[PDB]
Design an enzyme around this catalytic site. Structure first.
Site, PDB file in Angstrom:
ATOM      1  N   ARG A 280      12.843  62.102  21.378  1.00 49.57           N
ATOM      2  CA  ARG A 280      13.611  61.016  21.983  1.00 49.57           C
ATOM      3  C   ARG A 280      14.213  60.133  20.891  1.00 49.57           C
ATOM      4  O   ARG A 280      15.232  59.486  21.112  1.00 49.57           O
ATOM      5  CB  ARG A 280      12.728  60.167  22.903  1.00 49.57           C
ATOM      6  CG  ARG A 280      11.835  60.971  23.837  1.00 49.57           C
ATOM      7  CD  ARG A 280      12.610  61.887  24.774  1.00 49.57           C
ATOM      8  NE  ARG A 280      12.815  61.298  26.082  1.00 49.57           N
ATOM      9  CZ  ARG A 280      12.835  61.950  27.243  1.00 49.57           C
ATOM     10  NH1 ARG A 280      12.636  63.265  27.335  1.00 49.57           N
ATOM     11  NH2 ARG A 280      13.042  61.252  28.339  1.00 49.57           N
TER      12      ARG A 280
ATOM     13  N   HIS B  23      15.401  56.521  22.259  1.00 47.63           N
ATOM     14  CA  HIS B  23      14.493  55.434  21.867  1.00 47.63           C
ATOM     15  C   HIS B  23      14.488  55.093  20.384  1.00 47.63           C
ATOM     16  O   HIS B  23      14.825  55.926  19.548  1.00 47.63           O
ATOM     17  CB  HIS B  23      13.056  55.798  22.206  1.00 47.63           C
ATOM     18  CG  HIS B  23      12.764  55.860  23.666  1.00 47.63           C
ATOM     19  ND1 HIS B  23      12.829  54.751  24.484  1.00 47.63           N
ATOM     20  CD2 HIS B  23      12.390  56.893  24.454  1.00 47.63           C
ATOM     21  CE1 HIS B  23      12.508  55.101  25.716  1.00 47.63           C
ATOM     22  NE2 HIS B  23      12.237  56.396  25.724  1.00 47.63           N
TER      23      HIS B  23
ATOM     24  N   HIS C 270       8.230  58.092  28.730  1.00 45.33           N
ATOM     25  CA  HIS C 270       8.125  59.530  28.490  1.00 45.33           C
ATOM     26  C   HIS C 270       7.096  59.832  27.387  1.00 45.33           C
ATOM     27  O   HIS C 270       6.243  60.709  27.533  1.00 45.33           O
ATOM     28  CB  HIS C 270       9.492  60.107  28.093  1.00 45.33           C
ATOM     29  CG  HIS C 270       9.498  61.598  27.949  1.00 45.33           C
ATOM     30  ND1 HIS C 270       9.655  62.447  29.024  1.00 45.33           N
ATOM     31  CD2 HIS C 270       9.315  62.392  26.866  1.00 45.33           C
ATOM     32  CE1 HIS C 270       9.571  63.699  28.609  1.00 45.33           C
ATOM     33  NE2 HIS C 270       9.364  63.693  27.304  1.00 45.33           N
TER      34      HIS C 270
ATOM     35  N   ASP D 248       9.649  52.239  19.607  1.00 44.04           N
ATOM     36  CA  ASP D 248       9.391  52.404  21.043  1.00 44.04           C
ATOM     37  C   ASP D 248       8.359  53.499  21.270  1.00 44.04           C
ATOM     38  O   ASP D 248       7.504  53.371  22.143  1.00 44.04           O
ATOM     39  CB  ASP D 248      10.658  52.790  21.834  1.00 44.04           C
ATOM     40  CG  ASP D 248      11.685  51.676  21.893  1.00 44.04           C
ATOM     41  OD1 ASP D 248      11.310  50.504  22.064  1.00 44.04           O
ATOM     42  OD2 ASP D 248      12.880  51.971  21.781  1.00 44.04           O
TER      43      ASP D 248
END
Lengths: 217, 214, 216, 215, 219, 217
Positions: free
Chosen positions: F172, F178, F139, F182
């Site tokens: 995120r 995450h 994403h 990440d």
């Protein structure tokens, strides 16, 4: 077996037997190998990098202060010169308690732990240039006890005064004379000796005198 | 915000006479720092102590509401500190409760709104969920010890020790992070300097001392 | 005075007075608040995530092993079944020392520190779903002492054997029964008890017997 | 690749009889890990001990070369372990020195070539800059204690304790990281199992014990 | 304010007003006392011990690279010499953007934090014997922006190219010129300036020219 | 491995044109390392942010499926990025979604199969959820690649746009999908796929088209 009012009536108000037992009050200093010590080291590094800023300049200056200059170091925060010539009553009050706070209130713990100081630990110099007895800080204890007393005389400026007293300790951290935990501990002990001083007649006499003098001018 | 003019029996000072805790105190350890990592380790140590004898005392101290703090020093003081056995003293300590617990902590407490350990781990305690920094209870406990020590110097160490442990109980019980109580002792000692400038406080102090001598 | 050869001659070879003083030999366990303990926790998390792999499967199996099944758990590494039926002499040797290594060699330190175990600490179950006396690990001590003995009988396979014994400890770490420092400590103590066993006549008799059996 | 066939007086075993330390031992803590952070803290602790009494003993143990290790147990053993006062025993311990110090560590030592503390900090010690993991000296010190304990069970604790402290001295003195000596004890104990399968070793052991009894 | 295309048209393509605001994009650098900084230090130590390996040798070499030698440092990965003599169109492209990536895209944040560099922090020398402005790394930004551009010209070798560019930054870490977080930050900023460059007409002209040239040196 | 030859509407490139994320990226922080200790601390910080306004935006961004990413830039872009209000632009960003989200991450994502925060702590997130393949974030890669492209179209607002794209990844982190490392890794890989896209003819055609459309209004 230890100086006190009966050996130096001009530096102490109390007797050995009236001293706060710092060894029993205070938790031990962070041991190397602990996360807390890892923090002391990090604060030492932070202080080190501050040595070159303006704050570092003030720190170097505060490190020059010997026990006797501590009182005068609050003139700015107090709002008027704290000198023997401009305020002998007040100057006498603060000077006669110097070792009550710097020695009697720290002696016990200071001699048992014999903690090594930052500069000695890293084998490097300090910002202003007893490699032990670092915990707790005698200077910080005196600085903080002085602030508490001074704030009672001039409540209108307690915050400036308290702040100044707090920063005197931080200067030792920034300059390399103490680990952060050494000064934090000193404030506990330094506030305690102030409670005892309030039970001492001589101290009480000078306090009233110093306050009268303050109202006077 | 409350003060002596709203609750003359819980405060001696006015809002304008309060220590500015926000400007005195450094901020609390931020999550992501080594200091906070230490706060967490101290929370774990306290948690495991919950089952020892020290943990029992801790649970008991956590039951203490502001009003019971004075009486919690009876053992250390050497005599019962109650309205019935020492009304003069009991009155002195009770009227300063919020000077130390509220005025001396308000500013920093409301700005940081620090989350408490039990809330952070979403677990219960040994006995709101914010305003954890600095500890109001610890401030009151320490301010009280400093005052009590001036009345009975012969037992200053027992008294100072008891006052110090009241703070540590909140750490062991999960109500505060270690840094919350350390901060509270700076602020609690400061409010005591101001109290000594207050006439009403001075009157009761003398009274309490006279009562003690009696 | 606790159990020993005079109370359970089939689980011990030594007497209380012949035990290694683990309390005086071993350094204390990592205290919470130290960097070392931070490492114990990290190893616990690593073990936890391994619980779902193949290694985790073996771990769960090893956690099922009671003191009596330890000897047979080396059959694969030893190269032949270690059972009462296939090797009674050997099976007798290893079984009679189980508590010399699992108890006598750990008792002192184990009862003084009464260290809490991982699963208890996190209030979560283990992988093979006592909460104290975690330091040092009695199981690991037994596992390691057994490997040292077994290696003397079959030097040709010492590495496989030593390796299996080492992994028995690690399974406890992965499964949540012990902190890493608990098993590391156990191997110092487990190797020590083996030195004493070699001075014990009965042990020496069975050792020779077990070797003779191995030769046949 | 020395072994018994090259220096029959320093080894009992052959290269093929050696413990594969590389396959047994986990790798050493990597810099960047929490474990290494602990090794550094232990280094600092040892450094500050350098000035105490324990530090004095540490400096002395750091002077011990492989040959003086046996004699260093005299106090714990209860009697002088010298060629003159106990040639049988002194012969036993001396001929196994490299079985423990070299064969049982070689594999892992040469693969990791771990840097030592003093080299890492570019400072001196209290008394090679690689091959730090595992410690050969510690392995020899620990294997020796295990053997000696078998000869004098009545003093196994003093003996085992002394052997343990020999390793710690290298930590305090800056020669090794804590994890180096912990690893050495695993390996040093293993080599002792092998020695017990060696006939020559078995002969000297019995001899040394007989001597002890006469003594 | 400072230099830009209107002061050094041969080192910049953009104007001060076309610069990425690194101060507003990037998070501040790890503060001493945080876990993140503890990691930066550990990486410094790791890099220090690498100084004696083969990787350390390459590192020392990359630390010699001044802004002008960066383009030629990709010759191996690119597959052919990137020099004024062998590829003047390409060599001109990469050289004229050096400060767009090394200065304009880092200036703002670099001057605000004035982060101390590792060697200065430890008071020791570097592996290739300014003490501030360490965050983000100007060199790494230039190295990474160059790789992104070069990868567009020779897609068949994008991985070798991108890898080389990535390693240029790591060399500074190993050599003691920057903390790991300084180079990580540089790649965010360096990639951003490349987006802007694609809106600049002069850049677009040279890009096409450099691609045409690339097509011809093949046959 | 899907690619342009299997879903010509989600990809512009072919498997053979993909960035080898496994070879470019360093491995993710291993549990037991100081770096991972920092990932966990960032997870805790994000968790506590979940109740603030930033947390609200975070929850909303976590609802965004690959197809809504383009429209999530309307505010920063300065105009609605929808199929109805800008079909040329909307088509450009949509057809590259998996080039950035899949091809540029596949290699490393499948090799490390890194566990996600919420799975690690066995707690829910801030918003049937995948539990591995956390490193790098697909994403975030798509979010960042989109920003880089969008900035080329509207340079006048590159900072707002770049900022929005950066924040999409941080959401995120805050939301627990995450670890910080990440998303950091995802921006390296996401910027790389944009270089390849510029060599692709179809992409080039839509880019020009999208720019023309932008000028139109």
């Amino acid at each position: 077996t230890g100086n006190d009012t009966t050996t130096k009536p001009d530096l102490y108000y109390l007797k050995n037997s009236e001293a706060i037992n710092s060894l029993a009050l205070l938790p031990p200093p962070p041991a190397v190998g602990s996360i807390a010590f890892l923090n002391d080291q990090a604060m030492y590094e932070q202080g080190r990098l501050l040595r070159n800023t303006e704050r570092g300049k003030l720190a170097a200056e505060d490190a020059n202060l010997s026990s006797g200059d501590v009182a005068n170091a609050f003139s700015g925060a107090f709002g008027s010169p704290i000198t023997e010539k401009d305020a002998p009553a007040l100057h006498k009050l603060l000077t006669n308690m110097i070792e009550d706070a710097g020695d009697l209130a720290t002696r016990s713990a200071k001699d048992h732990y014999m903690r090594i100081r930052p500069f000695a630990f890293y084998g490097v110099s300090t910002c202003n240039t007893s490699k032990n007895g670092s915990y707790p800080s005698g200077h910080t204890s005196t600085g903080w006890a002085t602030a508490l007393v001074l704030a009672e005389i001039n409540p209108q400026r307690q915050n400036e005064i308290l702040k100044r007293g707090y920063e005197l300790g931080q200067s030792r951290v920034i300059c390399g004379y103490h680990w952060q935990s050494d000064v934090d501990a000193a404030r506990v002990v330094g506030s305690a000796v102030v409670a005892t001083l309030h039970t001492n007649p001589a101290f009480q006499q000078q306090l009233q005198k110093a306050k009268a003098e303050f109202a006077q001018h």
